[PDB]
Amino acid sequence: SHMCDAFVGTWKLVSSENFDDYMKEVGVGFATRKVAGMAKPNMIISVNGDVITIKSESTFKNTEISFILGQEFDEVTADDRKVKSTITLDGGVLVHVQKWDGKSTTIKRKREDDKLVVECVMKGVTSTRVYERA
């Protein structure tokens, strides 16, 4: 159905801003922030039918989620939070909401020019992570 076509592919992190602050807001501890903040993950997005898969490979952690839009799932984040996640498409933006311990964070993923821009928001803190095709 060509849902998410423009996201599919292999992407490499090329810039980050305010990610340490976003991680602090989320509750990540010092040593994990330092190691995760160094990483330059490879994000691999694919679609098979209604199922979207987002994999991240890095020297820190490798992660993988598979999901159907609008349908809540279990996720273990790279910092080992056990969260309940729902991912939707809103106006061509992938919106990923994570709920845990009465907290919430939202991760938005959008295509902008030849980049895939990832915006991570926790309370008033935003981190912007820019990916290019690998």
Ligand SMILES: O=C(O)Cc1cccc(-c2ccc(Cl)cc2Oc2ccccc2)c1
């Ligand atoms: O995907 C994005 O770029 C933004 C992004 C989105 C959602 C979660 C995290 C994230 C939150 C905490 C920690 Cl410790 C690592 C994290 O990701 C990683 C995973 C591997 C390597 C580095 C950061 C990063």
